[PDB]
Nucleic acid binder design. Structure first.
Length: 141
RNA sequence: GGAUUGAAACGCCAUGCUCAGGCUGGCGAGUGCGCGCCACUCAUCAAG
């Protein structure tokens, strides 16, 4: 669970002449002190065959995922980054094991020496179990 | 391999809590109160 913090901020300039008539406005800004998010995804090769999604497209997709947040900087988003990317590659065109059982292999738990609310990625320990025989595990990050 | 009222779908761009203000002015621990009254080191033991 995350506990967003509300930050009150002020601005020197007023926007309208009406409110000018002592001249400052107070706004607020919502931030998550820290949070680690898990995103699942699926790529269907049979659908790709119907639209030409090729291997160069897949490599570009992995590149986007690992570099997704590098160009999305803004005043509101703070610092976001991709920490880890596990890819399960199936031998067969359609799958070889149930997806939900593969997602279970990625265990995310808190480091041993860390207590209290998490404030950095170092407070978490992430491990990947052994995948079934028909699936290959790749760690792009 | 035609159709999961489906297929596609950012809440998003940005914004000083600031400018400043002695905890101060001053107030005896002080007046006083015997360690003191007594009590043998002593009764013996060649020098070789």
């Amino acid at each position: 669970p995350v506990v967003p913090q509300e930050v009150s901020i002020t601005r020197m300039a007023v926007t309208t002449k009406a409110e000018a008539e002592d001249n400052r406005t107070m706004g607020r800004k919502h931030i998550v002190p820290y949070g680690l998010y898990v995103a699942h995804g699926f790529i269907s090769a049979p659908l790709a065959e119907k639209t030409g999604f090729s291997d160069e497209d897949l490599t570009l997709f992995w590149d986007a995922l690992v570099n997704m947040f590098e160009h999305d900087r803004s005043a509101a988003r703070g610092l976001m980054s991709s920490r880890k990317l596990i890819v399960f590659k199936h031998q067969n065109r359609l799958g070889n094991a149930p997806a939900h059982k593969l997602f279970d292999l990625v265990k995310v738990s808190r480091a041993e020496g860390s207590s209290g609310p998490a404030r950095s990625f170092a407070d978490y320990a992430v491990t990947v179990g052994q995948a079934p025989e028909g699936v290959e595990v790749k760690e792009m990050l």
